[PDB]
Design an enzyme around this catalytic site. Sequence first.
Site, PDB file in Angstrom:
ATOM      1  N   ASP A 178      -8.341  -1.114  -8.674  1.00 40.54           N
ATOM      2  CA  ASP A 178      -7.744  -1.497  -7.384  1.00 40.54           C
ATOM      3  C   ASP A 178      -7.655  -3.056  -7.294  1.00 40.54           C
ATOM      4  OD1 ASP A 178      -6.677  -0.642  -4.788  1.00 40.54           O
ATOM      5  OD2 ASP A 178      -8.723  -0.708  -3.986  1.00 40.54           O
ATOM      6  N   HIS A 192       0.807  -1.187   0.000  1.00 41.58           N
ATOM      7  CA  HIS A 192       0.000   0.000   0.000  1.00 41.58           C
ATOM      8  C   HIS A 192       0.873   1.284   0.000  1.00 41.58           C
ATOM      9  CE1 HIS A 192      -3.726  -2.477   0.826  1.00 41.58           C
ATOM     10  NE2 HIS A 192      -4.105  -1.611  -0.109  1.00 41.58           N
TER      11      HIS A 192
HETATM   12  C1  LIG Z   1      -2.122  -9.223  -5.450  1.00 41.71           C
HETATM   13  C2  LIG Z   1      -3.578  -9.634  -5.571  1.00 41.71           C
HETATM   14  N1  LIG Z   1      -4.365  -8.894  -4.597  1.00 41.71           N
HETATM   15  N2  LIG Z   1      -4.619  -7.583  -4.718  1.00 41.71           N
HETATM   16  C3  LIG Z   1      -5.367  -7.204  -3.662  1.00 41.71           C
HETATM   17  C4  LIG Z   1      -5.609  -8.346  -2.785  1.00 41.71           C
HETATM   18  C5  LIG Z   1      -6.272  -8.626  -1.597  1.00 41.71           C
HETATM   19  N3  LIG Z   1      -6.988  -7.736  -0.832  1.00 41.71           N
HETATM   20  C6  LIG Z   1      -7.122  -6.320  -1.091  1.00 41.71           C
HETATM   21  C7  LIG Z   1      -6.947  -5.636   0.263  1.00 41.71           C
HETATM   22  C8  LIG Z   1      -7.098  -4.133   0.083  1.00 41.71           C
HETATM   23  O1  LIG Z   1      -8.379  -3.911  -0.475  1.00 41.71           O
HETATM   24  C9  LIG Z   1      -8.503  -4.414  -1.792  1.00 41.71           C
HETATM   25  C10 LIG Z   1      -8.434  -5.937  -1.747  1.00 41.71           C
HETATM   26  C11 LIG Z   1      -6.221  -9.973  -1.144  1.00 41.71           C
HETATM   27  C12 LIG Z   1      -6.904 -10.434   0.067  1.00 41.71           C
HETATM   28  N4  LIG Z   1      -7.742  -9.624   0.741  1.00 41.71           N
HETATM   29  C13 LIG Z   1      -8.210 -10.349   1.760  1.00 41.71           C
HETATM   30  C14 LIG Z   1      -9.166  -9.810   2.809  1.00 41.71           C
HETATM   31  C15 LIG Z   1      -8.315  -8.960   3.756  1.00 41.71           C
HETATM   32  O2  LIG Z   1      -7.434  -9.452   4.456  1.00 41.71           O
HETATM   33  N5  LIG Z   1      -8.610  -7.633   3.718  1.00 41.71           N
HETATM   34  C16 LIG Z   1      -7.904  -6.651   4.536  1.00 41.71           C
HETATM   35  C17 LIG Z   1      -8.745  -5.373   4.408  1.00 41.71           C
HETATM   36  C18 LIG Z   1      -9.675  -5.576   3.195  1.00 41.71           C
HETATM   37  C19 LIG Z   1      -9.658  -7.076   2.869  1.00 41.71           C
HETATM   38  N6  LIG Z   1      -7.710 -11.590   1.771  1.00 41.71           N
HETATM   39  O3  LIG Z   1      -6.860 -11.656   0.650  1.00 41.71           O
HETATM   40  C20 LIG Z   1      -5.525 -10.924  -1.900  1.00 41.71           C
HETATM   41  N7  LIG Z   1      -4.887 -10.641  -3.028  1.00 41.71           N
HETATM   42  C21 LIG Z   1      -4.927  -9.372  -3.485  1.00 41.71           C
HETATM   43 MG   LIG Z   2      -7.710   0.939   0.188  1.00 40.09          MG
HETATM   44 ZN   LIG Z   3      -5.684   0.299  -3.345  1.00 36.39          ZN
END
Ligand SMILES: CCn1ncc2c(NC3CCOCC3)c(-c3nc(CC(=O)N4CCCC4)no3)cnc21
Ligand SMILES: [Mg+2]
Ligand SMILES: [Zn+2]
Length: 335
Positions: free
Chosen positions: A240, A82
């Site tokens: 995103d 991020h």
């Molecule tokens: C590299 C592939 N990729 N890109 C994003 C992402 C991802 N979550 C993002 C978290 C930020 O908000 C946009 C989606 C996840 C992932 N997200 C989650 C749920 C999780 O842990 N979150 C934390 C806050 C929002 C969702 N579990 O795996 C896996 N590969 C990704």
């Molecule tokens: Mg965000």
């Molecule tokens: Zn983002």
Amino acid sequence: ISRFGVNTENEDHLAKELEDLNKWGLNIFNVAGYSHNRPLTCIMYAIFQERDLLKTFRISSDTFITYMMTLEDHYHSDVAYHNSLHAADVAQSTHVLLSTPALDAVFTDLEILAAIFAAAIHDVDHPGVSNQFLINTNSELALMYNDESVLENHHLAVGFKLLQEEHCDIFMNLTKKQRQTLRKMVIDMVLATDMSKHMSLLADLKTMVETKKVTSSGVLLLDNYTDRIQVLRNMVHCADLSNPTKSLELYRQWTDRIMEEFFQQGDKERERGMEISPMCDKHTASVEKSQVGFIDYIVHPLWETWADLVQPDAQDILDTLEDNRNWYQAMIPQA
Ligand SMILES: CCn1ncc2c(NC3CCOCC3)c(-c3nc(CC(=O)N4CCCC4)no3)cnc21
Ligand SMILES: [Mg+2]
Ligand SMILES: [Zn+2]
Ligand SMILES: [As]
Ligand SMILES: [As]
Ligand SMILES: [As]
């Protein structure tokens, strides 16, 4: 401005990579390397000139660079995913979705401007931990924002607070009504990036693809503001959630980054004796099943649906995603 560093070779290499500015296959990691770690400033400068946005909105090239440079310094370089490179990559990706043939002549220049800015600011000052982490640990932020779209409200706050100083104010020569409409739209789109809002957003998108009206020539008909902002907020969300739709070589680097961020949060959780969130556990979570799960439950249904809205424009993105999923499944040692 052709370079941000001391290396004369980079002007050429940078200018080389920027030839892919209008393409899905741009490599933002290279832009980052050839621009002295200014992927967001460089990319946004590039996007703005390509779209003639600085002329159309009387933005001094100087005010813009100083704003972008500062926006970018407010991304945390010590956060694995991020950081400004993800901001750059979401800005650039949105730039390409805005030029999709099915949306030709649909958006005003203010709207195009709002979407690209939203993209740029949409994770600024991200601390590296999720909303639920900030809420469960009683963060100053969760206290400020009352646990609703904590990070997203914050990112917007920071982006617009950076415009207060005249020397940074890139929207100086918009009209009050224009700024007003920009703020309303940017706010809508950045808040739309909250994963907690995703099902509601996909649902409503599926329910726009149902009553969709492709005009005689080929472009979609979107007459009212309400339909237009709904596409934009979905476009930036797509952007995103676009990493898995990029070449495998890029997807894997992104994947590595986000898992690094997620395990950093796991460690911080454990350090505090909190319940460790499953996907944040470096000791038990499979990186590979995470991506197969992410695509199958979140990314595919979103893009499957975006691809539907604008077909056949996104068909190549769907084919790439499906191939990338299979690559990851095939790296799971179990059937
Ligand atoms: C590299 C592939 N990729 N890109 C994003 C992402 C991802 N979550 C993002 C978290 C930020 O908000 C946009 C989606 C996840 C992932 N997200 C989650 C749920 C999780 O842990 N979150 C934390 C806050 C929002 C969702 N579990 O795996 C896996 N590969 C990704
Ligand atoms: Mg965000
Ligand atoms: Zn983002
Ligand atoms: As540049
Ligand atoms: As400033
Ligand atoms: As997690």
